[PDB]
Amino acid sequence: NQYDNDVTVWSPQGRIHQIEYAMEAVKQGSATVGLKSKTHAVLVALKRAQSELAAHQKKILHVDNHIGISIAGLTADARLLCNFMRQECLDSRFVFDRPLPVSRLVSLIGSKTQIPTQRYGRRPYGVGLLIAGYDDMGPHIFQTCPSANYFDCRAMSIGARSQSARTYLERHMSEFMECNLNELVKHGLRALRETLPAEQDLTTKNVSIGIVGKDLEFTIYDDDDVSPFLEGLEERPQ
Amino acid sequence: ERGYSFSLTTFSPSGKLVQIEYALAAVAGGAPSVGIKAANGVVLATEKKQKSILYDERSVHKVEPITKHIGLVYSGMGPDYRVLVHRARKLAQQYYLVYQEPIPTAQLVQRVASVMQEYTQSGGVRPFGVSLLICGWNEGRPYLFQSDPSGAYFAWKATAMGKNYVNGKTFLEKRYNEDLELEDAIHTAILTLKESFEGQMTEDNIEVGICNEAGFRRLTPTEVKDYLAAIA
Amino acid sequence: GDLVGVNKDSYLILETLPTEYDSRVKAMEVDERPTEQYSDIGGLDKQIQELVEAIVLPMNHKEKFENLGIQPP
Amino acid sequence: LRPGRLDRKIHIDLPNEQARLDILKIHAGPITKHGEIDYEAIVKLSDGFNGADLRNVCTEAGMFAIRADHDFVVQEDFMKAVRKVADSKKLESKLDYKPV
Amino acid sequence: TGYDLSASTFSPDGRVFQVEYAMKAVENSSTAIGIRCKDGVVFGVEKLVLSKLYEEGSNKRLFNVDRHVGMAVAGLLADARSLADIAREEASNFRSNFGYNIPLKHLADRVAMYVHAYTLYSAVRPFGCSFMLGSYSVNDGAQLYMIDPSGVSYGYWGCAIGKARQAAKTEIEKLQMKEMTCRDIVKEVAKIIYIVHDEVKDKAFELELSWVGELTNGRHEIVPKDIREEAEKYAKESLK
Amino acid sequence: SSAGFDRHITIFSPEGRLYQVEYAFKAINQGGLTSVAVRGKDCAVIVTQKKVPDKLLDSSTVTHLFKITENIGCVMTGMTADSRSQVQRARYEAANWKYKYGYEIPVDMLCKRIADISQVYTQNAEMRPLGCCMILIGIDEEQGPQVYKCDPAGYYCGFKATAAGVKQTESTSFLEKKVKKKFDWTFEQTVETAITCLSTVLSIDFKPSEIEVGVVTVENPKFRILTEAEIDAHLVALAE
């Protein structure tokens, strides 16, 4: 246990336990699911409430006109990487007068989170970024980790009981290319409803959906314009 | 580095400094040496043993000059000696650039020990493990000073450091006296060096430097072999 | 260094006893013979091989070693 | 340890390269093999081994031959056995001691 | 224990365990091998598909430092992208100051000193990466280098990094290497990956191949992979 | 005994020792290597074997003989990564002597610069003391050849013939019986003793491939690494 204190100290087995503890901090946040078609990229999030009178903590946040991210884990590491994220987008907008491609922006994040995972007295960033956007060659769904291993995926889910969320995806991943937005979105929120207890699903207070498209800027809906998407659903069987 | 800067030497609950006491133990296990101030110049003598027959003797030196009238020997560990030599070499020059005048022997010991005392109080370093003996015939009367890793300094008529330094301390108290000459001082300096040395004493077993009012001078192994007649 | 049965009065050897051991040693003998057939243990198939190669085969096939003719481990 | 009770102190050490070659030729005596044996490449990978370690290499190389039921011994079973036995010497240390 | 915490303290027998721990952290990763023919260097990296886990083409461990210099990393992944950023940065300063392409002998030495520098202080840890360096030049030939986490850097004709290291290099020396052309070697490297790593450990695996040499005019690029497809066809002839 | 943190960092023991530096002297011995230096009347000879355990491992990238300047060569023992980083310290400060002072650096003045650097590793208590050893040769004007040695403790002294590596106590016991019995040293007299001292300690009678010989002589002051052909010429020369 004495070698499980600092980030610098290697293990005699060869596993730095501080990163392995930061993976547990991602699993405490609420679940969220992102996916993409050939022409669209939709990520759906789930909110929680601290109490009944308290409002629900928001998950999806706009970054640029095509890039928007989801969140899991801490909230200080959320806004600290968010301020770095908005900064880098408008810099290349100021310098090259073009939007950043999604892939090489995420490579800047893995370089950013690398230094506090190696030097002394610095925690890793407990964070669960799911990233969606357009470069010039279509939609992209990315996920990160506190170990800074970014993954070019097609559908993932991170947070609390995303174990069941992943299982729904591969038995419908072949359908996720030809279908358009009206059933692409409600394919995604059929995956959130198994990350839940069997008595509440989506009652217009805890779900948000962000869509980026070809002729579509990244748009976030919340609890009032989500209601057109929440119709046309079957209940959970038993 | 990072900026830790914390001193690793603190007080004991008894009220002592433990690491300085441990550094003096490394001085006492050093090579023996002796220095005698007798009324016209100062005689320094060390005890240089090559551990094998393969070593070169004209390469590594013990009696080391600082100015043309200031010499300096030690008893402690080898590599830490060469640090504060080069420090004291440069420190004698800023006196000479300012004042255009050769630095007095009391003036180095004010300044060399101030380097050495502050170095113990500073953060994240051990003290030195070297005691010194400093000589010089400044303004007629010669001088003989002794510093230590505790930062202090003294002024001896004749003293000895290294191994068996208390045995040569009793030897110098009986054999030496108030006044002598330079040639008598070398005779008793070898006599206290022969007290604790090995069997054969040649031109390479010992190495002797002297001060005069004509200046600091280091003896070659020819005359040391020549003075080795009527040994001790 | 043998254990023999001797008459009390005449002091004469009358029996040869089998040698007995310490009482703590006799507790170490196994008499239950449990059952833990190899299907119960899963995911350790390479280690099951290298145990059987080392121990079970010298217990059974002495000739397979001696035809190559070296040693058991 | 004073002389008179224990007179002469005889020192036994780890085998040299010729000595690792000779011990390997000893334990490779009664092995049904083929005429392909480079002993020199085995000793070149052999460093700091015991005499019992080279006994183990001759033991393990036969165990590769009992695998797939080849009663002969090929040369390539040895270099697998050398890398296995030298792998197991990540568990031992402090083998030298000063005399007396 | 008691001496294995920092990377600035020696053990009482004369080594540093923090470097020793990070070496076998590289050992737990999958197998990446490398080999050179007489006019080129061929890379080959086994990549494991877990269940789906990515769009195929994600996070390939065959990086690209310079126009004529390539990587083949293994071990930890995030620090390997850090060393790629150091090596791309170092080759740019040689271009700017000295006006021509970086020799592979210097590029190995400048990186290995940087890897060495994190093994001396208690403030930072040693790297958990190991990799390869392949290049080609008409004035130099084909060179292949190799860097451990401790910082030892020298040459090879062939090497292997990963779990299968000693078991994977036994069949590398079985080949001929001098007289071969690298296009023959491209279908050779496929079978060494395909022989090792039985699907008992992981059912799904996938092969990448990178390739620099005389046919590629000194420039480094990936193989035509979906094109010509003679890796997997010639490798699956190892059925008996 | 242990007191405070004497077993861990560079502080003094109660006895006056300090253990981290004398842990570093047996940090050399894990290299498994022995170097021998012999100075003669007008020549100086370095001789050191190498071990090449793999056929895939190259031949030119192994040699510890490191040309510092045109007139000064050196050999390295101890671990490899600490040895190479020691060399570019020596290459850098040899060039600074030419820029600051014009003329060529002596071989003795360089070992003052190295050992004062290696002092600070011992002297400060937050940095690792670089467990490798240093051996130089060179020709001086009006002084002939020289042989020096630097240490991780940071002290230097000249020699006449002195080995390093693992087998000092056997080689120096051989050379003391060899030097002092009134031997006149020609060129080949130094070379034949340089092989046969190592050939009796290790008891090999080697092929001409394992060893390397660096040489310097006052007829050609350039540092020179021999070729295996002329190594074989001197090797059969002592084979009467």
From Swiss-Prot, chain B:
Protein's cellular compartments: Cytoplasm; Nucleus
Keyword terms: Acetylation, Cytoplasm, Nucleus, Phosphoprotein, Proteasome
Positions of post-translational Phosphoserine modification: 5, 12, 14
Residue numbers bearing the Phosphotyrosine modification: 4, 22, 74, 119
Induction: Down-regulated by antioxidants BO-653 and probucol. Down-regulated in response to enterovirus 71 (EV71) infection (at protein level).
InterPro entries (UniProt xref): Ntn_hydrolases_N (IPR029055), Proteasome_alpha (IPR050115), Proteasome_alpha-type (IPR023332), Proteasome_asu_N (IPR000426), Proteasome_sua/b (IPR001353)
One GO location term (cellular component): nucleus
Any one Pfam family match given in the protein's UniProt record, by short name: Proteasome_A_N
Domain of life per record: Eukaryota
Modified residues (N6-acetyllysine): 68, 169
Coiled-coil stretches: none
GO biological processes: proteasome-mediated ubiquitin-dependent protein catabolic process; response to virus
Main location: cytoplasm
Post-translational modification: Phosphorylated on tyrosine residues; which may be important for nuclear import.
Disulfide bonds: none
CDD domains the UniProt entry points to: proteasome_alpha_type_2 (cd03750)
UniProt subunit comment: The 26S proteasome consists of a 20S proteasome core and two 19S regulatory subunits. The 20S proteasome core is a barrel-shaped complex made of 28 subunits that are arranged in four stacked rings. The two outer rings are each formed by seven alpha subunits, and the two inner rings are formed by seven beta subunits. The proteolytic activity is exerted by three beta-subunits PSMB5, PSMB6 and PSMB7.
Membership in a protein family: Belongs to the peptidase T1A family.
Descriptive protein name: Proteasome subunit alpha type-2
Native source species: Homo sapiens (Human)
Swiss-Prot record, chain C:
Superkingdom as given in the UniProt entry: Eukaryota
Post-translational modification: Sumoylated by UBE2I in response to MEKK1-mediated stimuli.
TM ranges: none
Coiled coil: none
Compartment(s) of residence: Cytoplasm; Nucleus
Function: Component of the 26S proteasome, a multiprotein complex involved in the ATP-dependent degradation of ubiquitinated proteins. This complex plays a key role in the maintenance of protein homeostasis by removing misfolded or damaged proteins, which could impair cellular functions, and by removing proteins whose functions are no longer required. Therefore, the proteasome participates in numerous cellular processes, including cell cycle progression, apoptosis, or DNA damage repair.
Record's disease association: Deafness, cataract, impaired intellectual development, and polyneuropathy: An autosomal recessive disease characterized by early onset of deafness, cataract, severe developmental delay, and severely impaired intellectual development. Patients later develop polyneuropathy of the lower extremities, associated with depigmentation of the hair in that area.
Assigned protein family: Belongs to the AAA ATPase family.
Name of this chain's protein: 26S proteasome regulatory subunit 6A
The organism of origin for this protein: Homo sapiens
Gene: PSMC3
Residues of the full protein shown: 148 to 220 of 439
Swiss-Prot record, chain E:
Induction profile: Down-regulated by antioxidants BO-653 and probucol. Up-regulated by bacterial lipopolysaccharides (LPS) and TNF.
CDD domains for this protein: proteasome_alpha_type_3
Residues where Phosphoserine is found: 238
InterPro entries from the UniProt entry: Ntn_hydrolases_N, Proteasome_alpha, Proteasome_alpha-type, Proteasome_asu_N, Proteasome_sua/b
Keywords: Acetylation, Cytoplasm, Host-virus interaction, Nucleus, Phosphoprotein, Proteasome
Disulfide bonds: none
N6-acetyllysine modified-residue sites: 52, 201, 225
The keyword Cell membrane is annotated on this UniProt entry: no
Subcellular location: Cytoplasm; Nucleus
Main location per the UniProt record: cytoplasm
Record flagged with keyword Phosphoprotein: yes
Any one GO molecular function term: ubiquitin protein ligase binding
PROSITE patterns reported in the protein's UniProt record: PROTEASOME_ALPHA_1 (PS00388), PROTEASOME_ALPHA_2 (PS51475)
GO cellular component terms, semicolon-separated: cytoplasm; cytosol; extracellular exosome; nucleoplasm; nucleus; proteasome complex; proteasome core complex; proteasome core complex, alpha-subunit complex
Any Gene Ontology biological process: proteasome-mediated ubiquitin-dependent protein catabolic process
Domain of life per record: Eukaryota
UniProt xrefs under Gene3D superfamilies: Glutamine Phosphoribosylpyrophosphate, subunit 1, domain 1
Stated role: Component of the 20S core proteasome complex involved in the proteolytic degradation of most intracellular proteins. This complex plays numerous essential roles within the cell by associating with different regulatory particles. Associated with two 19S regulatory particles, forms the 26S proteasome and thus participates in the ATP-dependent degradation of ubiquitinated proteins.
Family designation: Belongs to the peptidase T1A family.
Protein name as catalogued: Proteasome subunit alpha type-3
Taxonomic lineage from the root: Eukaryota, Metazoa, Chordata, Craniata, Vertebrata
UniProtKB/Swiss-Prot annotation, chain F:
Predominant place of localization: cytoplasm
Modified residues (N6-acetyllysine): 98, 100
Cell compartment(s), UniProt: Cytoplasm; Nucleus
Glycosylation sites: 1
Modified residues annotated as Phosphotyrosine in this record: 155
Modification Phosphoserine, positions: 13, 59-60
GO CC annotation: cilium; cytoplasm; cytosol; extracellular exosome; mitochondrion; myofibril; nuclear matrix; nucleoplasm
Family matches, as PROSITE patterns: PROTEASOME_ALPHA_1 (PS00388), PROTEASOME_ALPHA_2 (PS51475)
SMART domains listed in its UniProt record: Proteasome_A_N
Source species, domain of life: Eukaryota
BP terms from Gene Ontology: positive regulation of canonical NF-kappaB signal transduction; proteasome-mediated ubiquitin-dependent protein catabolic process; proteolysis involved in protein catabolic process; regulation of inflammatory response
Keywords per UniProt: Acetylation, Cytoplasm, Glycoprotein, Nucleus, Phosphoprotein, Proteasome
One GO MF term attached to the UniProt entry: NF-kappaB binding
Function: Component of the 20S core proteasome complex involved in the proteolytic degradation of most intracellular proteins. This complex plays numerous essential roles within the cell by associating with different regulatory particles. Associated with two 19S regulatory particles, forms the 26S proteasome and thus participates in the ATP-dependent degradation of ubiquitinated proteins.
Family membership noted in the UniProt record: Belongs to the peptidase T1A family.
Protein name listed in UniProt: Proteasome subunit alpha type-6
Organism per entry: Homo sapiens (Human)
